[PDB]
């Protein structure tokens, strides 16, 4: 009922106005503003019905309420603020939101204009999670931000650095027992870090990496007791990984003893092992891992990793485990120099080159799978041709996915390792390689082809100069092998 | 098995020794001390059986372990510490403790010598209630202190100021959600304040009063959700009351706006009302309440209290409510001067002296009850005489209790009020009093007698000089009434 | 040279622009922004000449620079900021400022618009007084604010609460050795409190009173070593006094143990005694001193004050000393009730009413002086009439000043004291009074007249209702005396 | 006067006792303890004469005073404490101390027993350098510790970690202006770090390295204004250097961006350049510099250093400058691998191997000097033989000093560099070397000899295993050169 709705908003806006006036005017007592406050509370509650029709979100904007509500977030009393937050949550709830086409956009825009996020942060900075009500408020705020994020992610960057990111770190860092709020915070932080480098940089600046390490480290020598705790842990790990997609952060991770903590996680063999592995991989990946690569060997990483290379936890699937391990190995071979490189190579000569044997075993495994996949793909293509279905970029994407699933990346890594290993002028290794290859009649040629293919697509999101360099380097392995 | 037990202690003490040695010696790695730690943990666990025979608490003292265990509270790693704490708890548990006669005393003495409490405090000061294990540790420590307190309360004073009291305040003050630990802390603090003035003084010094007020004030505009929360609230109130038994603390309470907070609690009419009333009473009681008395009237206390005097919450029993109200009134009449006294008196002239009528109604009610009680007592005495049972001090105590239950104190207060009221040179009041008295044929004489009796026993725990003064003052009321 | 000047501003504004651009663009190195910074520094220095012609302050506003400069206060590097501050100081310097008529107004307005003060505060909040350069910056900022204050004091209120006031308190409170900066801060704070109640309230809120007490208390048991230290002390005292002109602050002073500290200062007899006296007077003055009055007697103030009443430090002049003492006495007589009033009165009965004798001595002294002054005034009036000079409000003001100097206020106070004293139903006092009066043939009548006059002008800056009440009260003294 | 002296100590000890008693007993007022305090103060002052005869330091120990005085450091009031400190200073003053043989030892022992240092630290932790008196106290304490350190340096280790070291860092870190106290602190800290590894480790643990860097960095972009500031800077540098003698600290220095800060100091060319150079050298020296070596090249250290290698600041002497530069180069050649090694080598091929030319120039310079020195030494030896003076270890030490002064170390470094350079399989370099050598007829042989000599004495303070390894390595250079 549209006229009625309109009337109702004015019902609040005046109340909103007058009660402010009351606050301003008569000297500071309960009685002279007090009864206003109850009125305010109840109107807000009533308005919670308003979220059923977002066809009517052209309204709230319309004259006065948007700014007024925002202004109310700083109210001298928490119960107004929390009510406001609640309203926003109901009002902002995506799941009831995503129907309305104009209704969504305007409100969000208004919020952005009013720098809603900053106000929310400010409000938070005065809450007290001892008081159940207040605690609910925090949760509500978090929910609201999640909702906003889902609708329009361009505000993520200014949302963080409106102080939100700094608040999140503080809440994580707080020596409080685990509760839903912490989990929510973790979730939000993770979301904030999805594909956004500015946010990552901000986190790095704020000593966020240190915080992440510390929070994580609990699960080194303990083990989440619940789905909730576990979920939180996972979120944290994800956040860390996201942060690591950025070079500056490699160094921060290094400084914060990230490498040591992940190696301890591996040694411990608790649940965090898989995540730790992933983190390690992320730390080491490109040129920008070199220092991390070198340090890993220094802290005896080789002793932790090669057992994992050799046998994969009876108990994340096996492929993933293999993928990460091999990835790490590849990284090490790319980047390592001096004594650490020598150390690495030595692990390919013990014990009668058993690791080379392992590598070749792996290669055959992956190769067979790849072949199978390839055949299937070919068949599909043929079928498409028969049916006159044109193969476009979506089709190619789909095909790529299949290959990925079969293990393309792992295979590529293996091939790379093999190439680098046979370029070490260590006869024993080379002989073992070639011996093994013809002996079962797979061929150098296949390996070469694979290498070439890998080179072709290397470096997806980086300077063209880089790509050509890397490709060239990889090709150079083929000369002496 | 006693020899076996002996053997077992050495099994630990060496382990305790050697592992320290290990820690000292080989540069700081996991492996060189690490495996020791598991051994240490397990031995401690095993020892937890030892608490079945306290006939064997002459042992642990005996050679080495007591000091060693204490030293272990500061171990570089929390898991040792927590284990130790657990052991202590099992070891110290009263309920399994109070059988052994020598066994109890020695261990406790040893602990005292080693200033166990300080060490515990230190340990606490490095815990992290984010980690469930650590949180358990805190609880365990609290339990241990409770146990110790129950056995030998002479250590309370040095227990507090071994930093324990300061720690407790901090934990209460912490803006964390409510959990068992908070409740435990509250309980412990309350216990610490039982009949011990040094502790109270310490609390006052530490801004403890402020802390207590702040924690309390939540329940002004909210209302405990659980038995646990409610219990905590009650504990807090008790602590506050205990603190208030000491003059210096009156002033701190005043400064901290205690009076205002309790008046708001009264006005609010939530659960905290009864407790608030009690607190108010405690604030106002003697000469040392004068300032509080005067301030109460200043913040319009009279408006809050006289309604409670007039009608007692339909919904602590009625007698208690009446007792506290009348007590407050008595205090006010004793202490109030200047304009506030005038204000107070005015409340006895409206509306046609309705409050005097109320007072006389109350007096008759209490008087009848007292008479009934007295008759019963007389009967009992007679019976005793018949049976040849000699009435001793226990008997008199018992009799006193009966009188207390019937309402002696309230009656006394009422009488005092009546006397002071009729000494105000306000004819209207006096006429109302005397009119009422003969009209129903109870008598001035009875009232006088009551007053005399009150005077007789006044000031239980205070200077003899004071008592004689107060008594004299009270008698002086009888001249002109 | 006006065109040249114009050219010069553009010379900066571009540099200002481009260097920001540089900062924005090339990844964070010295070299790529670094050389810009030197250019920036030097241009600013050059501009320092610009403050010779404020006839050219219509310019800087004109296009770009005002906002740009403000924006530069938050520069990532302190040396820019400090340069900017320096420029502002040179640019804002009153003494070279107050000539230009339009030139002044526009710049100041611009600054206000840009909320210069907030920016300055922010800048301060990142300084480091270890570094001499930075320390100079603080001083410069202080100077600038002083300058601004002198020109347009309407910004004082938002200047404070732009955080400036809070910063000042922090700097005062800092446990650093005494230096010019502290002195400057003190000066500024004092200025801020001149005739501005909002500022006072803010100070009160911020625990400013406590800070002031603490800083002051050093000079209880020590004694400024330099004119600078002494000056600072004086400033602090002034600030305190200013704060005390506001009722809420009475209570804060009370709570902070201000009364105790001033009484200790009196007892100590160091330099701070005069200031302490003044502070005490300010605490006690009106109805709103009642509580302070009562507390003073409680902490044995009477023992400290009556010696000062009796003999005035051989060593602020004597009149001032007398004025303050008598003022305090008057306040006490106005406000005191109960036991404290009795105590006060007792000091007028010892020793054979020697204090009454003292009072009458004082009265005659002041009276003679007043008479002398009055005669002079009359003569002046006569002369004016002869010369045909019309007596207007300025003339009356001038005359009032003369009377004030002669001691009107003190005399009035004395008279008030006498009246209140003779209304105590203490025959001894009354007899002493009247005995003394006729014995030297001055007269009740004169005293009465004086009282009337006092009543006439009482309560200058307060509700008309209040004034009539107070006047009435004062008149009431005349009935029984 | 010995009996008199004895009497005097009792005069205090009772006063010391009784005043404590007074404090204990009568409720907390000025008057009841107050007058005691003045007595206490004056006796202490009087005792200050006692430091003229340390022949009488068998006394103060003797019965009571030592512990009493210590206990007085925690007195409820700073003026007692400061007096005590003053007494200690006078009492402990070395320069008046070092005569007495028994008198010194006993007092110091007593102090140690009473853990004087901890008490002093505690006292400090409650001071307030705003108050001139208090500030003097700090200085006095510092002086006392210096004195104690000079007499018996075995207490340094427990002196630090009695919290003294942590206090020192805090005081350095304090954002206060520069004053004598800071300088004193710097001096003390430096002393504490003289040849004591435990202290260094403690400093490292406490984030001391970070503190040192931060304090230092001021002088990157500024320049001490006074001898005092300069002195402080020097002290800081020394401390840093001392810290760097320990491997763990290399890593802390690295993490704290020490390398970057020293390179900026070099680039800046302010006074701190020499110190920075030294620091760099210390960071890079042995195997334990490898990481630092590698990082230095990463932050473009090569660009900063090789100019210094090439021409030595027109403006520490030239030899020292050369010594440090060459040292750094040597370190780099020892430790560098991978790409950084390549980079380093490239600097020996530009521009037509000008750096090789430079190196050979340097070598000849140093060689001539060495030869001169050697001749002198020979002459001296001959003279000794003639005179029948037996050459012992002192003589050899003396001779070594001469060689050091002439530049042995620098020469050795140069030789090492030459050897490593000619082992790079870079023909151009080798040809340049050998070309140059015979061309002026100095000889490979000499160089070889020098190398051998260097190897002989290498690794002074380290494992014998290490020494043999290093020596072997150095010899290995001689094969291919």
PDB file of C-alpha atoms in Angstrom, chain B residues 26-209:
ATOM      1  CA  UNK B  26      71.036 -27.887  23.476  1.00  0.00           C
ATOM      2  CA  UNK B  27      70.284 -24.782  21.306  1.00  0.00           C
ATOM      3  CA  UNK B  28      66.637 -23.958  20.794  1.00  0.00           C
ATOM      4  CA  UNK B  29      64.974 -26.636  18.651  1.00  0.00           C
ATOM      5  CA  UNK B  30      61.833 -28.753  18.877  1.00  0.00           C
ATOM      6  CA  UNK B  31      63.455 -32.164  18.734  1.00  0.00           C
ATOM      7  CA  UNK B  32      66.007 -31.868  21.590  1.00  0.00           C
ATOM      8  CA  UNK B  33      63.499 -30.962  24.338  1.00  0.00           C
ATOM      9  CA  UNK B  34      60.258 -31.923  22.440  1.00  0.00           C
ATOM     10  CA  UNK B  35      59.920 -35.622  23.208  1.00  0.00           C
ATOM     11  CA  UNK B  36      60.616 -34.857  26.928  1.00  0.00           C
ATOM     12  CA  UNK B  37      57.475 -32.744  27.022  1.00  0.00           C
ATOM     13  CA  UNK B  38      55.150 -35.589  26.067  1.00  0.00           C
ATOM     14  CA  UNK B  39      56.679 -37.717  28.834  1.00  0.00           C
ATOM     15  CA  UNK B  40      56.121 -34.876  31.290  1.00  0.00           C
ATOM     16  CA  UNK B  41      52.504 -34.480  30.203  1.00  0.00           C
ATOM     17  CA  UNK B  42      51.702 -38.165  30.599  1.00  0.00           C
ATOM     18  CA  UNK B  43      53.330 -38.562  34.012  1.00  0.00           C
ATOM     19  CA  UNK B  44      51.259 -35.640  35.288  1.00  0.00           C
ATOM     20  CA  UNK B  45      48.112 -37.286  33.934  1.00  0.00           C
ATOM     21  CA  UNK B  46      49.050 -40.553  35.626  1.00  0.00           C
ATOM     22  CA  UNK B  47      49.581 -38.720  38.910  1.00  0.00           C
ATOM     23  CA  UNK B  48      45.966 -37.543  38.751  1.00  0.00           C
ATOM     24  CA  UNK B  49      45.112 -40.955  40.196  1.00  0.00           C
ATOM     25  CA  UNK B  50      47.245 -39.993  43.298  1.00  0.00           C
ATOM     26  CA  UNK B  51      44.384 -37.827  44.690  1.00  0.00           C
ATOM     27  CA  UNK B  52      42.458 -40.912  45.818  1.00  0.00           C
ATOM     28  CA  UNK B  53      44.714 -41.317  48.886  1.00  0.00           C
ATOM     29  CA  UNK B  54      45.442 -38.073  50.750  1.00  0.00           C
ATOM     30  CA  UNK B  55      46.806 -40.347  53.481  1.00  0.00           C
ATOM     31  CA  UNK B  56      49.730 -40.080  51.055  1.00  0.00           C
ATOM     32  CA  UNK B  57      50.062 -36.266  51.002  1.00  0.00           C
ATOM     33  CA  UNK B  58      52.935 -36.445  53.471  1.00  0.00           C
ATOM     34  CA  UNK B  59      54.851 -37.716  50.394  1.00  0.00           C
ATOM     35  CA  UNK B  60      54.806 -35.093  47.566  1.00  0.00           C
ATOM     36  CA  UNK B  61      56.204 -32.504  49.921  1.00  0.00           C
ATOM     37  CA  UNK B  62      58.731 -34.895  51.093  1.00  0.00           C
ATOM     38  CA  UNK B  63      61.819 -34.559  48.961  1.00  0.00           C
ATOM     39  CA  UNK B  64      61.554 -32.559  45.815  1.00  0.00           C
ATOM     40  CA  UNK B  65      58.288 -32.238  43.913  1.00  0.00           C
ATOM     41  CA  UNK B  66      56.493 -29.341  45.596  1.00  0.00           C
ATOM     42  CA  UNK B  67      58.920 -26.618  44.554  1.00  0.00           C
ATOM     43  CA  UNK B  68      59.557 -28.309  41.206  1.00  0.00           C
ATOM     44  CA  UNK B  69      55.865 -28.220  40.318  1.00  0.00           C
ATOM     45  CA  UNK B  70      55.668 -24.548  41.284  1.00  0.00           C
ATOM     46  CA  UNK B  71      58.695 -23.798  39.112  1.00  0.00           C
ATOM     47  CA  UNK B  72      56.902 -25.584  36.275  1.00  0.00           C
ATOM     48  CA  UNK B  73      54.049 -22.992  36.373  1.00  0.00           C
ATOM     49  CA  UNK B  74      56.450 -20.587  34.636  1.00  0.00           C
ATOM     50  CA  UNK B  75      57.413 -23.115  31.950  1.00  0.00           C
ATOM     51  CA  UNK B  76      58.199 -21.695  28.499  1.00  0.00           C
ATOM     52  CA  UNK B  77      55.105 -23.538  27.175  1.00  0.00           C
ATOM     53  CA  UNK B  78      51.490 -23.312  28.157  1.00  0.00           C
ATOM     54  CA  UNK B  79      50.671 -27.008  27.891  1.00  0.00           C
ATOM     55  CA  UNK B  80      53.011 -27.916  30.748  1.00  0.00           C
ATOM     56  CA  UNK B  81      51.483 -25.142  32.842  1.00  0.00           C
ATOM     57  CA  UNK B  82      47.943 -26.170  32.197  1.00  0.00           C
ATOM     58  CA  UNK B  83      48.755 -29.793  33.031  1.00  0.00           C
ATOM     59  CA  UNK B  84      50.284 -28.613  36.303  1.00  0.00           C
ATOM     60  CA  UNK B  85      47.176 -26.557  37.053  1.00  0.00           C
ATOM     61  CA  UNK B  86      44.969 -29.571  36.356  1.00  0.00           C
ATOM     62  CA  UNK B  87      47.075 -31.692  38.697  1.00  0.00           C
ATOM     63  CA  UNK B  88      46.791 -29.052  41.411  1.00  0.00           C
ATOM     64  CA  UNK B  89      43.018 -28.938  40.968  1.00  0.00           C
ATOM     65  CA  UNK B  90      42.716 -32.701  41.293  1.00  0.00           C
ATOM     66  CA  UNK B  91      45.269 -32.660  44.069  1.00  0.00           C
ATOM     67  CA  UNK B  92      43.639 -29.716  45.859  1.00  0.00           C
ATOM     68  CA  UNK B  93      40.002 -30.692  45.386  1.00  0.00           C
ATOM     69  CA  UNK B  94      38.448 -30.165  48.792  1.00  0.00           C
ATOM     70  CA  UNK B  95      35.662 -32.586  48.408  1.00  0.00           C
ATOM     71  CA  UNK B  96      38.149 -35.418  48.043  1.00  0.00           C
ATOM     72  CA  UNK B  97      40.485 -33.396  50.412  1.00  0.00           C
ATOM     73  CA  UNK B  98      38.644 -32.862  53.750  1.00  0.00           C
ATOM     74  CA  UNK B  99      39.084 -36.460  55.019  1.00  0.00           C
ATOM     75  CA  UNK B 100      42.852 -36.459  55.547  1.00  0.00           C
ATOM     76  CA  UNK B 101      43.971 -34.766  58.711  1.00  0.00           C
ATOM     77  CA  UNK B 102      47.768 -34.372  58.349  1.00  0.00           C
ATOM     78  CA  UNK B 103      47.605 -34.841  54.554  1.00  0.00           C
ATOM     79  CA  UNK B 104      45.697 -31.627  53.942  1.00  0.00           C
ATOM     80  CA  UNK B 105      47.750 -29.266  56.188  1.00  0.00           C
ATOM     81  CA  UNK B 106      51.261 -29.972  54.920  1.00  0.00           C
ATOM     82  CA  UNK B 107      50.582 -29.535  51.209  1.00  0.00           C
ATOM     83  CA  UNK B 108      48.750 -26.252  51.746  1.00  0.00           C
ATOM     84  CA  UNK B 109      51.599 -24.992  53.935  1.00  0.00           C
ATOM     85  CA  UNK B 110      54.097 -25.904  51.215  1.00  0.00           C
ATOM     86  CA  UNK B 111      52.019 -24.046  48.636  1.00  0.00           C
ATOM     87  CA  UNK B 112      51.893 -20.986  50.892  1.00  0.00           C
ATOM     88  CA  UNK B 113      55.667 -21.119  51.324  1.00  0.00           C
ATOM     89  CA  UNK B 114      56.111 -21.315  47.556  1.00  0.00           C
ATOM     90  CA  UNK B 115      53.606 -18.440  47.179  1.00  0.00           C
ATOM     91  CA  UNK B 116      51.623 -20.663  44.884  1.00  0.00           C
ATOM     92  CA  UNK B 117      49.075 -17.918  44.286  1.00  0.00           C
ATOM     93  CA  UNK B 118      51.569 -15.451  42.816  1.00  0.00           C
ATOM     94  CA  UNK B 119      52.875 -18.104  40.430  1.00  0.00           C
ATOM     95  CA  UNK B 120      49.317 -18.952  39.392  1.00  0.00           C
ATOM     96  CA  UNK B 121      48.603 -15.272  38.752  1.00  0.00           C
ATOM     97  CA  UNK B 122      51.748 -14.993  36.643  1.00  0.00           C
ATOM     98  CA  UNK B 123      50.692 -18.033  34.629  1.00  0.00           C
ATOM     99  CA  UNK B 124      47.243 -16.526  34.088  1.00  0.00           C
ATOM    100  CA  UNK B 125      48.779 -13.269  32.919  1.00  0.00           C
ATOM    101  CA  UNK B 126      50.196 -15.205  29.958  1.00  0.00           C
ATOM    102  CA  UNK B 127      47.077 -17.192  28.966  1.00  0.00           C
ATOM    103  CA  UNK B 128      44.854 -16.685  25.910  1.00  0.00           C
ATOM    104  CA  UNK B 129      41.160 -17.468  26.337  1.00  0.00           C
ATOM    105  CA  UNK B 130      40.803 -17.783  22.543  1.00  0.00           C
ATOM    106  CA  UNK B 131      42.387 -21.243  22.920  1.00  0.00           C
ATOM    107  CA  UNK B 132      39.912 -23.630  24.555  1.00  0.00           C
ATOM    108  CA  UNK B 133      42.703 -25.452  26.379  1.00  0.00           C
ATOM    109  CA  UNK B 134      44.027 -22.216  27.857  1.00  0.00           C
ATOM    110  CA  UNK B 135      40.508 -21.194  28.888  1.00  0.00           C
ATOM    111  CA  UNK B 136      40.158 -24.483  30.766  1.00  0.00           C
ATOM    112  CA  UNK B 137      43.412 -23.584  32.514  1.00  0.00           C
ATOM    113  CA  UNK B 138      41.986 -20.346  33.891  1.00  0.00           C
ATOM    114  CA  UNK B 139      38.928 -22.171  35.202  1.00  0.00           C
ATOM    115  CA  UNK B 140      41.128 -24.806  36.826  1.00  0.00           C
ATOM    116  CA  UNK B 141      43.205 -22.112  38.519  1.00  0.00           C
ATOM    117  CA  UNK B 142      40.049 -20.445  39.818  1.00  0.00           C
ATOM    118  CA  UNK B 143      38.822 -23.769  41.190  1.00  0.00           C
ATOM    119  CA  UNK B 144      42.161 -24.330  42.915  1.00  0.00           C
ATOM    120  CA  UNK B 145      42.018 -20.932  44.577  1.00  0.00           C
ATOM    121  CA  UNK B 146      38.446 -21.572  45.703  1.00  0.00           C
ATOM    122  CA  UNK B 147      39.565 -24.865  47.228  1.00  0.00           C
ATOM    123  CA  UNK B 148      42.495 -23.260  49.008  1.00  0.00           C
ATOM    124  CA  UNK B 149      40.258 -20.453  50.260  1.00  0.00           C
ATOM    125  CA  UNK B 150      37.774 -22.942  51.690  1.00  0.00           C
ATOM    126  CA  UNK B 151      40.487 -24.811  53.566  1.00  0.00           C
ATOM    127  CA  UNK B 152      42.572 -21.934  54.971  1.00  0.00           C
ATOM    128  CA  UNK B 153      41.136 -18.390  54.616  1.00  0.00           C
ATOM    129  CA  UNK B 154      44.171 -16.630  56.221  1.00  0.00           C
ATOM    130  CA  UNK B 155      45.845 -16.690  52.809  1.00  0.00           C
ATOM    131  CA  UNK B 156      42.975 -14.665  51.256  1.00  0.00           C
ATOM    132  CA  UNK B 157      44.703 -11.375  52.135  1.00  0.00           C
ATOM    133  CA  UNK B 158      48.097 -12.220  50.521  1.00  0.00           C
ATOM    134  CA  UNK B 159      46.299 -14.173  47.786  1.00  0.00           C
ATOM    135  CA  UNK B 160      44.699 -10.901  46.818  1.00  0.00           C
ATOM    136  CA  UNK B 161      47.708  -8.533  46.274  1.00  0.00           C
ATOM    137  CA  UNK B 162      49.704 -11.427  45.040  1.00  0.00           C
ATOM    138  CA  UNK B 163      47.954  -9.743  42.134  1.00  0.00           C
ATOM    139  CA  UNK B 164      44.986 -12.117  42.135  1.00  0.00           C
ATOM    140  CA  UNK B 165      42.533  -9.356  43.012  1.00  0.00           C
ATOM    141  CA  UNK B 166      43.909  -7.117  40.279  1.00  0.00           C
ATOM    142  CA  UNK B 167      43.683  -9.954  37.766  1.00  0.00           C
ATOM    143  CA  UNK B 168      40.070 -10.618  38.731  1.00  0.00           C
ATOM    144  CA  UNK B 169      39.059  -7.015  38.103  1.00  0.00           C
ATOM    145  CA  UNK B 170      40.756  -7.092  34.703  1.00  0.00           C
ATOM    146  CA  UNK B 171      38.940 -10.269  33.729  1.00  0.00           C
ATOM    147  CA  UNK B 172      35.600  -8.841  34.854  1.00  0.00           C
ATOM    148  CA  UNK B 173      36.257  -5.594  32.996  1.00  0.00           C
ATOM    149  CA  UNK B 174      37.205  -7.362  29.793  1.00  0.00           C
ATOM    150  CA  UNK B 175      34.823  -6.606  26.978  1.00  0.00           C
ATOM    151  CA  UNK B 176      34.285 -10.327  26.245  1.00  0.00           C
ATOM    152  CA  UNK B 177      30.976 -12.200  26.047  1.00  0.00           C
ATOM    153  CA  UNK B 178      29.645 -13.858  29.144  1.00  0.00           C
ATOM    154  CA  UNK B 179      31.000 -17.308  29.905  1.00  0.00           C
ATOM    155  CA  UNK B 180      31.550 -19.645  32.840  1.00  0.00           C
ATOM    156  CA  UNK B 181      34.943 -18.080  33.487  1.00  0.00           C
ATOM    157  CA  UNK B 182      33.453 -14.663  34.228  1.00  0.00           C
ATOM    158  CA  UNK B 183      30.975 -16.264  36.621  1.00  0.00           C
ATOM    159  CA  UNK B 184      33.791 -18.122  38.364  1.00  0.00           C
ATOM    160  CA  UNK B 185      35.769 -14.895  38.709  1.00  0.00           C
ATOM    161  CA  UNK B 186      32.745 -13.162  40.205  1.00  0.00           C
ATOM    162  CA  UNK B 187      32.296 -16.003  42.687  1.00  0.00           C
ATOM    163  CA  UNK B 188      35.944 -15.895  43.701  1.00  0.00           C
ATOM    164  CA  UNK B 189      36.007 -12.123  44.130  1.00  0.00           C
ATOM    165  CA  UNK B 190      32.900 -12.288  46.312  1.00  0.00           C
ATOM    166  CA  UNK B 191      34.523 -14.937  48.488  1.00  0.00           C
ATOM    167  CA  UNK B 192      37.666 -12.834  48.793  1.00  0.00           C
ATOM    168  CA  UNK B 193      35.583  -9.963  50.141  1.00  0.00           C
ATOM    169  CA  UNK B 194      33.780 -11.989  52.808  1.00  0.00           C
ATOM    170  CA  UNK B 195      34.584 -10.362  56.167  1.00  0.00           C
ATOM    171  CA  UNK B 196      37.993  -9.044  55.109  1.00  0.00           C
ATOM    172  CA  UNK B 197      38.656  -5.307  55.218  1.00  0.00           C
ATOM    173  CA  UNK B 198      42.181  -5.302  53.802  1.00  0.00           C
ATOM    174  CA  UNK B 199      40.856  -6.921  50.631  1.00  0.00           C
ATOM    175  CA  UNK B 200      38.073  -4.348  50.427  1.00  0.00           C
ATOM    176  CA  UNK B 201      40.584  -1.525  50.804  1.00  0.00           C
ATOM    177  CA  UNK B 202      42.740  -3.034  48.055  1.00  0.00           C
ATOM    178  CA  UNK B 203      39.717  -3.262  45.771  1.00  0.00           C
ATOM    179  CA  UNK B 204      38.884   0.378  46.470  1.00  0.00           C
ATOM    180  CA  UNK B 205      42.451   1.396  45.664  1.00  0.00           C
ATOM    181  CA  UNK B 206      42.409  -0.514  42.399  1.00  0.00           C
ATOM    182  CA  UNK B 207      39.314   1.384  41.127  1.00  0.00           C
ATOM    183  CA  UNK B 208      37.385  -1.812  41.822  1.00  0.00           C
ATOM    184  CA  UNK B 209      34.237   0.086  42.780  1.00  0.00           C
TER     185      UNK B 209
END
